[PDB]
Amino acid sequence: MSYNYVVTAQKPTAVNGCVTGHFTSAEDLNLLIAKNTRLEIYVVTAEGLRPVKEVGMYGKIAVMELFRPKGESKDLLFILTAKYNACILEYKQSGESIDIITRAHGNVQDRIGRPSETGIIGIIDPECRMIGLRLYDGLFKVIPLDRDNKELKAFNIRLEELHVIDVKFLYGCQAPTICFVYQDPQGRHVKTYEVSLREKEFNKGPWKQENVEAEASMVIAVPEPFGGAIIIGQESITYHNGDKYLAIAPPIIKQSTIVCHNRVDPNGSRYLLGDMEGRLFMLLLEKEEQMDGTVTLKDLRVELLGETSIAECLTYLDNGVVFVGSRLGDSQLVKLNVDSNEQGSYVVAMETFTNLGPIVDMCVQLVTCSGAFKEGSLRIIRNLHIRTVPLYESPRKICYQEVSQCFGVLSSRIEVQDTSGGTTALRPSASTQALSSSVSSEVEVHNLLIIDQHTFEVLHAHQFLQNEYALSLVSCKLGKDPNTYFIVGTAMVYPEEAEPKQGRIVVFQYSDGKLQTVAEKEVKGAVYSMVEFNGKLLASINSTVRLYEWTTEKELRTECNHYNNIMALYLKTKGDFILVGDLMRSVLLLAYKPMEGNFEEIARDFNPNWMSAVEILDDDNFLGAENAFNLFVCQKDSTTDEERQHLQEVGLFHLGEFVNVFCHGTPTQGSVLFGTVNGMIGLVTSLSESWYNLLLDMQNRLNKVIKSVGKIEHSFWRSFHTERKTEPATGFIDGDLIESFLDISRPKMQEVVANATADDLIKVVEELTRIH
Amino acid sequence: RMRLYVGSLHFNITEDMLRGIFEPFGRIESIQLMMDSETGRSKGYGFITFSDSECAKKALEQLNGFELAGRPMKVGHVT
Amino acid sequence: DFLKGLPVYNKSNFSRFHAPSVYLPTREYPSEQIIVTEKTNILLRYLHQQWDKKNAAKKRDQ
Amino acid sequence: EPGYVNYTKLYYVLSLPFVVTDLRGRNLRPMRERTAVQGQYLTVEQLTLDFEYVINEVIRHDATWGHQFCSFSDYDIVILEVCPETNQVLINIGLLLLAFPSPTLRPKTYHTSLKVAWDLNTGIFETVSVGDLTEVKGQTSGSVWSSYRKSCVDMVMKWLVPESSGRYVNRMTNEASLKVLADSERYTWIVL
Amino acid sequence: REHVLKQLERVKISGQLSPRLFRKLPPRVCVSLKNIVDEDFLYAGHIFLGFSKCGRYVLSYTSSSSFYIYHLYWWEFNVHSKLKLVRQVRLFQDEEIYSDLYLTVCEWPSDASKVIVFGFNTRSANMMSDENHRDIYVSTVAVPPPGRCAACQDASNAQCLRHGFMLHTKYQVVYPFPTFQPAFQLKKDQVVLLNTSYSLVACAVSVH
């Protein structure tokens, strides 16, 4: 049996959402930041952003909206988690005491219904008549906001439009009205429906359905006096309001997709727009006062403000200060000013907030491949001290070569098809600014970077072939050859085909500041993963795992193959044992048979799992991380050949993060570090039967004392969950929960340890805090 | 003894649905709704083979040009 | 060209230049309202809704 | 308690007729007897719904044209919905009947539809819709059942909401014909 | 069209990996039936039906012969590896069928322990083909155990009741012949709704 302990070394750093409003007090202008499970509450003060409280929710924050129903002195908060836990929260301060009140809560999951492509959408009516949720295709959930009733009886309305892109509640409406963009075989369209609480149905919307741009992706509900809606596409921006229809096709927006917006002015005269390249625009709604008192929209205009971090979200604060919430790079505070600088930009960075995510690969001190595109960096983490090395391109894989005192980093840069010749770089980056460079004998240009272990200076950049993608990387010694090499696994990616049918294994040696090609081996697919395996090279090509021998003639010679795979994306080895991770087909264990010079399929996990990362804990325990944000531990079944050929899932735990990399690096045994998409860094370790038993009893006791915001059960949160099944967590201890025992008051500690002393457990929890 | 062509069908109309709609007219020997091998879904066409020719004739007379879902069905003959 | 005159909630807020504590809810639980979902199927709800309105249209004449 | 419902329960260890067996051929042991503790036993249940009773009950109490009714001939039952969380079966009842028309006499053949919700916990049905009496003039028996099923198909398509990958009813059948056998979730095909 | 490597890159930076994204790309593996089928079952003439909901098994049937005898098979699938027979059951026990049935094998939404075989003939017989009557044959078969089963281990192909039972039934239908509605008939996880023309029967089988 397997017993494990999971703890957080570094909390998620990517920002998934940010809202402004008056939550703490009617006077305070607040900033609320959502970092997966984390909710940060701030007061916009004279000094700029005063932290008040950070609350960890027992769920992944999917909806975060402030709303003020009539009769409230301050805004209430609506939160919906990824596991569909819905709550309405109220902030209460009594002198020095701070408490978050759960006004209403419940689970709004439907057993039927398939999760939507553009995901969970949570919208609140401007007049606070109801909450609207788009969770599944074909259904629209309505939570009536009524304060004079025991329960908020939520119902579903059928939506004929099964593919909705975005939806919002309109302003200035006598009847609650939803405005949405949907897709059908005839293209994209914009439609409106009135929502009837009385009849539990939709009624004909105020205005006519209109056809829109094929890539129309977002709806902005414009407040009064304008009213109506703004729809943002790839090439155009349109305004709709009954009879009114304005359309602008500014060439400035064509290059990159707009992915976020924020209302600057309360009347919606100005909006901030953020795109995929990090560009910041100002959308201007020019008004015209009518003689009858009403105000109509005369024209739309877009102006490029400058560049910020690639924004996931934007929030205007006060006095030209804007918060840039980034997912792929560092978050910022930026200042907007009327007079342009040396480059002509109106955007000036005021502060930078370190974001480790996405951690695509890492090394063990921890060294990660962080961020993406212009935000791409390396992050060096130690006891936490963080050093950031900008690359201005996407780092993909990392390896350390001790003998060369450097790191091998695979990277990709974006180049554009110009008038003359081939392609040209749009921005200088690590691969184009190396000390020396070589070449192999919009588009992605792949490179192997040799970066100095001390200064992190780009010593050499080796550019791979036209259309060649570098997928895997290893630094090792092979056979009886004394040399240490940088080995790269590639794939030929053409703009005609879908799957790679060609690739290479390239053996490089770094000497005298240059990279020399020692050997090349052609393969008939993508080299997804490579591991050094007992002085041999273990590589996975498409659906085949292959073992190569390195000859005295400096050539790779195929020894054996295993073909029973769908997509062998992940490889890990311990001794003669191989743990293969499949993107679609769960995990499997192989054994190399020295005597037979071939592989033997030992056992497979017959469970359906879409894998993201795999690790070998020990000879008998295998750790898996999948697409549904869960961890699971496989074990060899401890009489018949078929019984031994079946891996058993003995550990289940809902992590709440997407793990891209696992690496190894008395109470607990073993130390496996993991890097996630949200920049969270965690640690997994093994426990004895008796250590697990004591810590499990401690969790059940802690859960009776520690209260949850939104009243989400800890057990529900950590329950293994997929679209297929929901099961209670097993053989896993939440280190975060047990560590929180040291933070509760002494009178509460005694009630937790009631029939063991508080000091017995204090000594236990304190030695557990020393594992990270 | 008689085969018909059924076309202009909605992509979600199943073989079982076609059997239910056509069976009241007469005994059916074989029904084969044509499917796409790549992205497994109905091609919108098929063949229904009645045991009786006069039973197949009445099925055509009563179903050809009439809307099943919102697409007007096309029932015809072969060879 | 058109950027000037940005929203001012308070002049003080960013004038002074720059460069949270974890909430562990203690044993206290005051809550009075729950969120529930409609048990009945939407097709059945609609048919029930139409048939019940038809019964009311029969009671008005009789 | 109602006359339209019939429930039967039978236990087994190593109205429709059942030939419950093991994987070899032994007909097991048909009983209701005592086998203390959950020591592996089979449980078969059978809840029946007499259509002819339902039809007569809904014509009698819930049809405005109920007084005009004489007798019914054939009937076709099509399931419109199954709600597993509320254990409710929505059935549509297609009906060929005989009735007198409006006071505008002579008895005529008509066609109508009866929607009825059947509770599986209680066994009790509840009527949700009673169709109008539409005359069958010169259209055959096959013509009327084809038009009826087309209307059911029409309605279920109209109310069709996509389900999650893993609540799907797998249905497999090969003629002797299939070209490929696909494993959807793992993008694997067996080519025949 | 989107390249698989381009789709994979998006996953690593977004943390969004789902099948409803790889929807429009070709199959990752194609295997021909002839290369994975055991040659000893050539002179048997199996009719392959497809995969079980979990890609572990691939099912097939046999229509052996005056009467017809039906058999349902469970084959262990492992990509390129040959298929291994796990279960072979005799469908419609002590039932004599005088005509080739159009059979369908179904699986419940969340119940992986059982399967349902619905077979029916084009028209019934009373040797001579009888109109206005049709025979429906339905069998509920327990699937093989997923792992080590403690009750199965107790033997003297001995399999416990939970992982080794079979249920059979047969009913005659009249005109208009009831519609086959497999998605609705098996929407409730342990029930089969059977339209016998005269009544609808809710049929639940469960092992405790």
Ligand SMILES: O=C(NS(=O)(=O)c1ccc(Br)s1)c1ccc(Cl)cc1Cl
């Ligand atoms: O229900 C049918 N077939 S089914 O597989 O149970 C299924 C349910 C829902 C969908 Br969508 S498909 C079906 C069959 C025949 C006739 Cl006449 C009408 C229908 Cl509605």
Ligand SMILES: [Zn+2]
């Ligand atoms: Zn068993």
